[PDB]
Amino acid sequence: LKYNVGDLVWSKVSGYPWWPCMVSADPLLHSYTKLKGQKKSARQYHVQFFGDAPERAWIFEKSLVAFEGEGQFEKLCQESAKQAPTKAEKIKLLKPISGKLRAQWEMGIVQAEEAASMSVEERKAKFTFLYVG
Ligand SMILES: O=C1COc2cc(C(=O)N(Cc3ccc(C(=O)Nc4ccncn4)cc3)C3CC3)ccc2N1
Structure with missing residues (x-):
């Protein structure tokens, strides 16, 4: 298995930028x-999205990248834009993200960079x- 609980990953979801995450156990499964x-x-891997408005998801491993730091983000954006197969899919991918989501993402990056400097435990x-529940 590529990842375990506590590993840090970027997750890509349609409609959102590459987002910093921590692999976690699903609290039911x-x-x-x-x-x-x-x-x-x-x-799939179960992930927590970092930031001040917590969410979790099951994400396909094909849409995860090992997290090192914010420095990865520009390349991740560039590669997703180059991989968008059609003009129409690329226009969808590049839609602006709200200021409210930007601030959540920025707080997520702060948490994930702190997490990176810490032990798994x-x-x-x-x-x-x-x-x-
Ligand atoms: O501060 C933050 C941190 O987290 C965020 C996540 C999202 C969001 O809607 N996402 C997209 C996203 C997609 C799917 C799910 C999902 O299956 N949820 C499940 C699965 C199973 N059981 C229950 N719920 C969830 C999220 C994540 C960011 C890609 C938006 C703002 C924030 N702001």
Whole structure:
């Protein structure tokens, strides 16, 4: 497996910029990786999106990149724009992101860069979400 709980990754979701994340256990499934439809081609990882408006998701491994730092972001943007197969898909990819989401992303980057400087256990202790059902 490429990742484990506490590993830092960028996640790409349609409609959002590459976003800093931490691999975590799903609080119901008690799993951090699975194969969608039990297809060997469809491995997903469970991730927390860093920032002040917490979200989690199951994300395909094909849409994860190991997180080093904010310095990666420009290349990630450039490669996604070059890979957009059509003019129409590229226009969708490049739509502006709100100021409110930009500030969430920027706070996410601060958390992820702090997380990177920490041990796996330290970052899990600090950043793991609380769930209430
Ligand atoms: O500060 C922050 C941090 O997190 C954010 C995430 C998002 C967002 O809607 N996303 C896109 C996104 C896509 C899908 C899901 C998703 O399946 N949620 C699930 C799956 C299973 N059970 C329950 N929910 C969730 C999110 C993430 C950023 C790509 C927007 C703003 C922020 N601001």
